Structure 1
Amino acid sequence: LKGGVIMDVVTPEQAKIAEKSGACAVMALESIPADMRKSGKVCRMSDPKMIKDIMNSVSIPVMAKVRIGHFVEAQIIEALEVDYIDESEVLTPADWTHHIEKDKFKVPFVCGAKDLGEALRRINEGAAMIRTKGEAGTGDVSEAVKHIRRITEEIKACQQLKSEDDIAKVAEEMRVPVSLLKDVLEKGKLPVVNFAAGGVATPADAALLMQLGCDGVFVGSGIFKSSNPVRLATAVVEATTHFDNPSKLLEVSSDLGE
């Protein structure tokens, strides 16, 4: 899915709009935390029936969310044959101590991370994909930027550690195998694709995150709240593809509406 955009969709018809806009995948979900976050309610896995109905409407990959640590929700979502599971901090966590043991699943998982240690812990548990934790709901791209900058800075700082022994002390504080940390230092990158998520509101934001080194970007239901969802979704996809072409980012950002 590298170079691509994943969109949150709440109905089959939204999925079809996502797919026709250029999305590489869709993320099926009932609500969009938010309306529930400001309310108080527990956020859980969405009904399998609404997910299958989305899977039946497009021919691109479909992802779905489960609660952090909720390995039973994950077993149900795997049995449904979705393409990816997003063990998501947007939903209400089920286990505040243990993430899901992802290497016991066939289906790939994406997890969030706000820094290097977090990202390595998620990968060491078996995450196949990392995304920034962003700041979901708000439309403020700055948390996404903070987290991508932080991982990049931390990687660079580790790379200046001379002692193999100091490196080990770091792996220890992160609670990951030294081999995993060492593999990151030698490649100067996480060993899995890293996508931006949380606060990506405009085409500019999308191109920003790509220019900071993200392999792609998730966008939320904000696309569909806008006065023309097709124009906005197509504009974010173009911007993600042509992320280093100012005249084209200019063209796709012009006259977008509210």
Structure 2
Amino acid sequence: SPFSVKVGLAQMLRGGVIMDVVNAEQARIAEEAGACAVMALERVPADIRAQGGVARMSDPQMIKEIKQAVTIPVMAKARIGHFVEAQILEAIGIDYIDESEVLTLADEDHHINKHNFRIPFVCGCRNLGEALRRIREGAAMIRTKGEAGTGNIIEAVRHVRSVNGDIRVLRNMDDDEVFTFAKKLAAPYDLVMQTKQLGRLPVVQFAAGGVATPADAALMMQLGCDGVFVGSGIFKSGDPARRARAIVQAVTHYSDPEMLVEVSCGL
């Protein structure tokens, strides 16, 4: 199925770090550090909201410049529900669309019908019900929402533990009780049952929102994530290439405390 092909594309990112980049120079630093993909975005959405503004899809010109600078896949954000922003992003030829709550909400009641696109989408979630609803709408990849613009990992931990905890509950659950469970989740029963059969989400599951240090990134992986997204904090540093490499190594070697010390020491 077309959906299964999109799911398979996102599976290539397992074990990877996705980095926010604002120009071609940062994109090249991300790729050279070992990032599995880059997220093109023209201004920090928190800065846009600070001075009274609406955070939208970035200019296609800046996205093209990033796409031309790297070989790894390029993602870009569309406002929730803004299906025309997504049509434009797909027409630019990028690899993934992130339907993102970090941009300004465009439709309070509905997300994009992601099955209408060839390009895979990533969507956020805070619990299993949100994850399965985004998947039913066509998301091929899921991330936590975490907490944007703070560097605080606490919300991403909450979201990971919520999704993983309900998946674990679904494993031993009496089949007869799953109907009421799907009702309470407000999630499609068939996807609930698929998750029960697999013992995990039917798409890759990344951590995002507040992943600041190598320790944070390895924590997410030890909790069971398939990878992590990191924001612009990498490039606010004095040595962005070193900071980016440290996150990549933390995700690749998340169960090696000696490696985590090495990449954290003097950072």
The reply to whether TM is greater than 0.5 is: yes
Deviations 1:77-106, CA, capped at 9 Å, x for gaps:
011111000000000011010000001110
Please identify runs of 4+ aligned residues in structure 1 that moved more than 3 A: 173-176
CA distance in 2, matches of 1:234, 1:144: 22
Paired residues of 2:132 and 2:188 also in contact (CA < 8 A)? no
The partner residue of 2:63 within 26, 51, 54 is 51
Where structure 2 has 5 or more consecutive residues not aligned to the other structure, the ranges are 1-12
Distance 1:93 1:160 in 2: 38
Q: How many residues align?
A: 255
Q: Does 1:235 align with 2:246?
A: yes
CA contact (8 A) 1:101 1:126 kept: yes
Give the aligned residue type for 2:148.
A
> Which one of the candidate residues 230, 251, 254 is aligned to 1:219?
230
1:170 aligns with 2:181: yes
Shift in Å at residue 163 of structure 1? 4.3
Deviation at 1:176, TM superposition (A): 3.2
Residue in structure 2 matching 1:244, options 245, 248, 255: 255
1:74 and 1:248 map into 2 onto residues whose CA distance is 40
How far apart are the structure 2 equivalents of 1:173 and 1:101?
Answer: 23
Q: Secondary structure at the match of 1:211?
A: helix
The one-letter code matched in structure 1 to 2:80 is I
Q: So what's the TM-score if we normalise by structure 1?
A: 0.96
Distance 1:219 1:73 in 2: 23
Pairing 1:68-217 to 2, within 5 Å after superposition: 68-164=80-176, 166-217=177-228
Specify the SS of the correspondent of 2:235.
Answer: helix
Deviations 1:123-157 (A, max 9, x none): 00000000000101100011111100011111222
The Cα shift of 1:190 comes to 0.3
Is the 1:121–1:174 contact (alpha carbons within 8 Å) kept by the matching residues of 2? Answer: no
| Alignment partners' CA distance in 1, 2:95 and 2:166 | 31
Q: Is the 8 A contact 1:74 1:85 kept in 2?
A: yes
What TM-score comes out, normalization by structure 2 length? 0.93
Q: Which residue of 2 aligns with 1:22?
A: 34
Question: How big is the alpha-carbon RMSD for the aligned residues of Structure 1 and Structure 2?
Answer: 1.0
Residue identity opposite 1:178 in structure 2: Y
Q: Distance in 2 between matches of 1:126 and 1:205?
A: 29
Output the amino acid matched with 1:119. Answer: A
Asked whether the 8 Å contact 1:131–1:197 carries over to 2, the reply is yes
Q: What is the deviation of 1:170? A: 2.4
